[PDB]
Structure formats: structure tokens, C-alpha cells
Design a protein around this nucleic acid. Structure first.
Lengths: 124, 138
RNA sequence: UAAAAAUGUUCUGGAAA
RNA sequence: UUCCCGGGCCUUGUACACACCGCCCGUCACGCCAUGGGAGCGGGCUCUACCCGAAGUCGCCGGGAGCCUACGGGCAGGCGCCGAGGGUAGGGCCCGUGACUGGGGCGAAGUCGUAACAAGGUAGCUGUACCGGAAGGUGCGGCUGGAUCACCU
RNA sequence: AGCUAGUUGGUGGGGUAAUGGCCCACCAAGGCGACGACGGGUAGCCGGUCUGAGAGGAUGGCCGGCCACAGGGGCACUGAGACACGGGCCCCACUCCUACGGGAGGCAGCAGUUAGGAAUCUUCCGCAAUGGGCGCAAGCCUGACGGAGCGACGCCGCUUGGAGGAAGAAGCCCUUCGGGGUGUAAACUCCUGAACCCGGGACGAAACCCCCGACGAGGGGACUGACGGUACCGGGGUAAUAGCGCCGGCCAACUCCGUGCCAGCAGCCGCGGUAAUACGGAGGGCGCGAGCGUUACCCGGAUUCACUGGGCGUAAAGGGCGUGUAGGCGGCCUGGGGCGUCCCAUGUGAAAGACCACGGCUCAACCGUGGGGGAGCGUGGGAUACGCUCAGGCUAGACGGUGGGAGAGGGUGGUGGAAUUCCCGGAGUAGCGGUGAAAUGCGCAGAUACCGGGAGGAACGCCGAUGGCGAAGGCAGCCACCUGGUCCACCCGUGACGCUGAGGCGCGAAAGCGUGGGGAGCAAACCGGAUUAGAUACCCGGGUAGUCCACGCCCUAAACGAUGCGCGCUAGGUCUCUGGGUCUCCUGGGGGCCGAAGCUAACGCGUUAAGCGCGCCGCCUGGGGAGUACGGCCGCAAGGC
């Protein structure tokens, strides 16, 4: 563009879109599950991913994913939602923080327990 | 109607050296002589001279090159490797003596117009003056 | 430049290398 | 040696490369998500007009009617302008909603055909126009990002 | 996208500390806006802070400056100052008392509660210090402030031990069952001694005040410590915490078992379907450590909005084309001005922060002292190359003159022949037509084929193209009139009059729309016949709109060179159209092909640039969603922008 055109119109700034609204700026957000189901993954994959549709405090109702093997959540359990989408589950854009509120930790978890809200076990 | 007499001249010089011509003509204008006079003093050209092309006043620039080379493509290297117009009429450029650029870490010359005449970066620097930044050459 | 010539459909999802 | 089957060499087109037993288009059916329209309803903000109009400052008056007086005055009082706020009516912007409805994205193995990619078996694409389950067909015009031999420059 | 009545100006008043339509009479019609008024959304601004090579981008918490507010809203009083946070009046909402007529309050002060939230502290001690108000002073008040408390929330420092100690215990893990690994690790032996224990124990505090001297200068004296019996020093003194992430690639780190597209992992590519360094455990390893990971947001990387520092022939990207408004840009010589620009001096640029040097807490973090930068902007003085401006001059750009040229450029009116169809008249008879093959269809009510005549509509064969004209769309028989563009020669005139161009205006194939006319051929739709699994197609027979004209609309396209306009510069070869020549060939304008240099991802482009430069405009910013929706403007509609 000629300088005269830049003077007249100038460059336009980016303006990035939040990959995680519904959180409304917070790191996490609380919510209540209105349905804890089991969805089938995207294409290359096959499985029964455990996901729950959560009614957020921030006035949003979205579906989040339940990490780890086996959970204890049922309709009406209160959970703490967190950034993080799951590639297979289309529409699933947030994870459930394990080990906060009604979301128990992952029983018998020995590695990276911090990520699955499970306490360091006593040495037998 | 030549929107920019100077850039034109810089380009004539450029387009010519690129085909290894011996000399090139250019419409004459005092301010232009100043530029050439500098490229002359600085060694980029062999020199200029006022000539006459079919009734009108032109300047004839004598181009300079290096020696023929070995291998494929013996074409000699240019003395005027680069010669770009800095300030254009589309957007002028002026610099304070403290903002005068250094062309090619020294092996390059910058030409500027000042109240004290058309001088090189080096001179202007040793004169405490700034001005319009005509072009840079190396 | 000018330029004729064929009735007849379709092959599940991943992965080869 | 035209044709059918398999195969050599060159060339041509290609959206194929799991390499035509390839690729791939659109409707229909099911699920999810977001979104437009929709009798309209519920809000938020905001503009106009008019009605009632607190406190208060500022103008009258202060008299058939008080209190003070440093007796030219002053205070309390009464009238008015303005005025927060309500109120009635009608606009403007925005948001949320609404039976029903349009199309859209996405979703391991659904139904129908086969439009396109190789004169893809009617060269293709294209503006428009009419038509048809659907891809699309046809009309008019346009483009080459299409066209063997010969053959003309 | 238009906004404005106290609106814009004036005159005289009111008002104020003071200017002012701040307010009020009266008069005038103005004021503002694409240089973005008005409106909507969001937001306290700055010093600074984070990031960044920088230019930038993001941000505005703590500290410092300014502004604004004190439950919501209005108002005035007192006063040097407030239209006043712990003053007042009034209305409102809500909280509480009431003897029901009126009363009381406002933590966005300190601390604490509750609600909301992912989440953010003690109803601490002291006025000892600094600072403030009042007081002659003594001194009083001070939730400012100085401190302590709680929270790994952050940064800095410290500890969980040090030296010995096996061709190397056990246990666990692998294993080519020899052995390898954890591993000097442990044990064990010496050694130091975080904590804790006893003892001593601050700096911060010297002035107000008293005394000699004048209650001045100067000298002397006394009181005063919240933190705290804390820091710190001395002596004594026990081996005294370790976790979190990760190990398919990017990215440092691999093996066994379990699992079998399950369970699960996943920042991106992707792992898992019975030999998984990718899931889960284990052994092992790597990284970091009182922390380590996760999520969220900002800068970076992202020259991925490109000023520095990008692009548009085919990748996303040249507007369908003109004409032109604002705007941007501007050939050669000379002089005045000195606005831009540049230089010197000077004022400002608070402090803190940042940087640098040196110090103080044992270091560091913190912290003090000093030092050096600095654009901007004000002022005075100066320069004049370039830009600008004024003036004079110039002819190389551009325009005009005169004489010529080519052309399907445009508009209007005429008019010519070939052919198709229908009609009339001849003549003639059994089929014609159509296809891959046929059938529908036309025909013995006389078709097809043939001759003559007529009517009517549309398009113009050969010439004819590697052609020409036009800004584009586009233009083709011939003739006449009306009219545009353009090229050459002579170099005659003017004297920079130029280039581009957001909007605006005009033009704009085909299809389509309106009124009227016209209708031969062709032909969407439509009807038949075939074909086929079907056949709303392709092939065949029919056929309406339409195709044609007038006037008015519509405004799209593969409106294409998918290549905006103008100017200068950078080998040639060859064919061709058109003009001039001292017409071997040269020179100007145009159309093609091949190719120097250069350019390009490549294909290719290459004096008809996609090369090298300058000016101006338009446009691009991953793929879908989608040229869709909503809004607006246009349109009769279809639709268009």
C-alpha cells in the first residue's frame, strides 16, 4: 500500500478470539452437571469418552471432559471446569478438574497424580 | 513527466551498470550534478560531464567496474553494488546529525542535502548538520 | 489457427508403506 | 489386428498415490451444536412532549396580619421562576425470549442415484433464466483454466 | 452520516474571586461534520510496568501526580477554601427504634461479617519515630504512620549434612541365566552442629523543655522505645524434610509387565485393533527443588497488518470500463521569504522506577548517596541544499495550429443478393424425414424431389486473418448524412496548463423486466418418440416465452491478459497492420512469436515486463460457514451493492 494509503487507512490490529469463553476471563469456573454421559470420539478413533454437560455459574451450559480412568460424577455433582479441549469429542472445549468439589480423584493413581487430584499414598 | 528526477537518475545508473555499459545519459539539473560530483569523489563512478543530447542539456555518467573474472560468467563485479533512494516524494525523510545512518558499517556512503550543501554522511557528521536523506550507496 | 472419435452403474471403517 | 483379454515403448489428461477394485457430488434418514426468520410477548438504556412537583438559591410582595429596630431598615411570612423526583403518552438502540420454520457446521462402517476428476463416458467452468427426487439438465451469451490426424500460415 | 435553539454570533444586563450563552431579555442567522460531526460500545489519565534487537505491542495492580465519587439523586449554608467521606436540608430505596406523632443510620476510613466469586488477611500493639491539627507551653488528639500477625502470592538467602566407605550386602528391576542396574547409594566409621538450651542484649533518640548567655548564635542538662528480652554476640548442643513434572518427535530422558480401537492419552503431528520407548504400574532416567505442574491472560517467536519489514498472472488479492470532485504527487534556470527541515544557546522534562559507580543490612533480595541519558514542547539566535511559498525566465511534459492517413468505433436513414418458412400456379407419384438402429411425425385429402410467382422476418457467404477499430462491454453486405477516438509529418502557437483519482456522473455482453410492435428460422418451459434399471438428460419429432424493433428499466460474468493508470530506464531476432523518408533500409504508432540482462515457487514474463524505479488508486491477511444473515441504499420484479 502506498504510504498515502497507510496514512488514510493504516494497518489493522489482530484481535484474538478466546478458545475458552464461558470461563469469562477466569482461570477456572464452577458448575453443576445436568448430564453425565458417554460420547463416541471423532474419526480415526473409537471409544466411549466420559463427558458431562455442565451448567456453569457464568450463565453458560457447556460439555466438559472427565479425565482419568473411572469417575464418580452423576447428575447434579458440582464440579470445577478448566480450560482445555479434547480433539476427538467435537464440541467438548473444557476439562473437569479432578479432585475439587464433588469430583473425586483417581483411585490407585501413582504417576503424575497431581494432574488427577490424587494424594501421595503412604509407602504401603 | 518524471515524478522523481533523482530516483530516476539513481535507477538509470543502476539499470546501466547491470548490463555493464560504459556510460549513461541523464537529463541534467544542478542538484543532480551535486549527487554525481559526490559519487565521483567517493569512487563509485569514473566521473561525469555535462553533454548535449539533441538540443537539451544532459549529464553523462561514466560507470566503473572491477576486473573480468574466472570461471563461468566472467562478468566483473560492480563498484556500485547498491544504490537506493531513501527519501521519496511520496514520503520525505530528514535526519538529525545524531540520527545520520551508517551505511554498510562504513564501507558505504549515504548522501544527504543540508543547509551546508549536498554532502556525505561522513562530512555532514563532521559538520554537526542533518538534512534530507537523498539515498544510500555501497 | 480449424479439430472428428465412446450405449453400460457401483466397490463399508481403520491401518499398509 | 478393427473388436474382446493380458502386456511392451512413446505421448496426453488427472482432483488418483490404499494409485479406477481410485476419487467423489447432492438430496433423504438419525443425533449434537450454534445461528436467521417468526403471532408476538419480557427487559435495559435513551429521546420528546405534557401533568404534580420536595429542599434550595435567586427575583418580586412584606399588605386589612405579627416580632426586632442600630426606627432609611431587618426577620418570620405570602407569590413566582427554576427544579430532584414521580406520572401519562409516543419514538430510538440493545438484549433475552417464543409454537413453528430456513438454511449451516460437525458426527467409524444408513437410503437413492453418479454430477465432477482421464473427449469421466453429453469437454468443463460461468452470468442469467426456466425446469427437475437429488446431484444437475436445457436455453442465450461468455471463457479455455478444453479439444487426434491432416492442414493454413 | 448528517448533528444543532441557548443552538452560533451580537448589545445591554444578572452572576462570579475572574473570563464566558455561565444565566437572562432583545436582535442576527449562524455554528459543527468523511481532517469522521452526531450516535452506540468500552474505559478513570499519567510517571511507569511486562514484552520486544528495535520500531512496536500489551497494560495502568502496589508507590508517586492529576481527576472523579462518598447508599441513589438534587441543593444550598458557614467559610481563605466545600456545594463538604465520619456537616446540613429534601426526595428515593433499604436497615433498625417508637408510647405510632416522629425518630436513627450509610465502612469506596482501620479491623471484622455476610453475599457474589476460581480467589484476596488481625475485630493485633504503639503514638517510641516521621508527618498533621490545636496550644505560649506543658501537652492533647492522630486505625495517617511505625510495627507485629495470617497466606510459599512473589523475589532473595539458608537447611535436610560433610569426608571416608565393596571388582559392589540385601530388596526391587532387568537378563544372550555368565551377569547388568539402583550404587558410594545404604550399612558402618569418623566429623561438623539447622534446631533447640543458658547468659548478655541494641541501633532507631535528640530535640521540643529546663539552665548560663538576651527565651538570638553557641555551650550544658533531664525525660522518652510500640517492634522486644527481637536483632545481634558469647557459651552449650541433636544427623536433623523432599517433593513435583516429564522420558514417540518437537524436547533432556527406556526397559519389563498389564491392557487389546477397550481402558485411556492428546499443546501440534498423533498413540491404543494381542510383542504399545505414546494408555496403566513397575524398575530405570532426565529436568527442577520448597517447590513442581495445571488453567487463564499479555508480549515474543508471527516480515502472520510488513513504518523499520509483505504482498495481488496461476497460491487470498487489480475495481467491468470511462470521465472526473476532494485529496496525494510535481520538469528546467534564477531571486525574495525562511513555514517544513537542520544547527547552537536556553527554559521545561518532579520524585520514585530503569541504567551505571560506590556504599548499608554477614550475602542477596530490599535500601541509600552520587552520576549519565532523554525525545517532545516554549524562547532567542543562525543555515538555505531539499520541500513549500512569492516573483521573473525557460520548452524537453502536456495542449493547440496546418497538411495528411487507416479503421466491422458510434448514431440515423435507405437499400442488395443467397437461403429457410408459408401461400398461389405448374408438373409429377409413393414415399419423405430421421438415426447407432429406429419410432413419433409429414404423405395417395397428393408429401418429398422440381420449375415459376408472391409474402415475411432474421442474419449478411467469398473477401476474412497470425487482420482492424474501440476505454470497456463490444463492432462485419452496401450507400448517404451526422459524430468520437487515434496516428504521422512540418515543428508554427501556448508555456508546466501535468499524473492519479475516495465519492459523484456516464457507459456497461447475455439472460431478465415494463408498454407497444414484429415473429421467418432457432428455441428454455412444455408434449410426444426412442434409450435405459430408471431418463424429468444426452439422440429424434413438435413447441411457447425469448431471440428482432422502439422507448424505459435491470447492472451481472471465466466483464480474462484471470496482469489498474501514467512516466523514465534496461540486447536483439522475426512476421505483420498503418504513416513518413535522403522509400537496399531507416523512423513513428499498433498486433504476434522467440528470446539479453533481470525476475519467478515453478510454469513462465522479458521495450505490448511478471525487469529496474517514482506517483496515485483499488484489493489481500488460513479453509469451511458465505457473497449467507441482519441493517442500509437501489430495483417493477428477478435481484444488485
Amino acid at each position: 500500500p502506498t504510504i498515502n494509503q497507510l496514512v488514510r487507512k493504516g494497518r489493522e490490529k489482530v484481535r484474538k478470539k478466546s478458545k475458552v469463553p464461558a470461563l469469562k476471563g477466569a482461570p477456572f469456573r464452577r458448575g453443576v452437571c445436568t448430564v453425565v454421559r458417554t460420547v463416541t470420539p471423532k474419526k480415526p478413533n473409537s471409544a466411549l469418552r466420559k463427558v458431562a454437560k455442565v451448567r456453569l455459574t457464568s450463565g453458560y451450559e457447556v460439555t466438559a471432559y472427565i479425565p482419568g480412568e473411572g469417575h464418580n460424577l452423576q447428575e447434579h455433582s458440582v464440579v470445577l471446569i478448566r480450560g482445555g479441549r479434547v480433539k476427538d469429542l467435537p464440541g467438548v472445549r473444557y476439562h473437569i478438574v479432578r479432585g475439587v468439589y464433588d469430583a473425586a480423584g483417581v483411585k490407585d493413581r501413582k504417576k503424575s497424580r497431581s494432574k488427577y487430584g490424587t494424594k501421595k499414598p503412604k509407602e504401603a | 513527466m518524471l515524478t522523481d528526477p533523482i530516483a530516476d537518475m539513481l535507477t538509470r545508473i543502476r539499470n546501466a551498470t547491470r548490463v555493464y555499459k560504459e556510460s549513461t545519459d541523464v537529463p541534467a539539473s544542478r542538484f543532480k550534478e551535486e549527487i554525481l560530483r559526490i559519487l565521483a569523489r567517493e569512487g563509485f563512478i569514473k566521473g561525469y560531464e555535462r553533454v548535449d543530447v539533441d538540443g537539451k542539456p544532459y549529464l553523462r555518467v561514466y560507470l566503473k567496474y572491477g576486473p573480468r573474472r574466472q570461471g563461468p560468467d566472467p562478468r566483473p563485479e560492480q563498484v556500485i553494488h547498491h544504490i537506493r533512494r531513501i527519501s521519496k516524494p511520496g514520503r520525505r525523510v530528514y535526519v538529525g546529525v545524531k540520527e545520520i545512518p551508517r551505511v554498510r558499517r562504513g564501507l558505504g556512503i549515504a548522501i544527504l542535502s543540508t543547509s551546508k550543501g549536498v554532502l556525505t554522511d561522513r562530512e555532514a557528521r563532521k559538520l554537526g548538520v542533518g538534512g534530507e536523506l537523498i539515498c544510500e550507496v555501497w
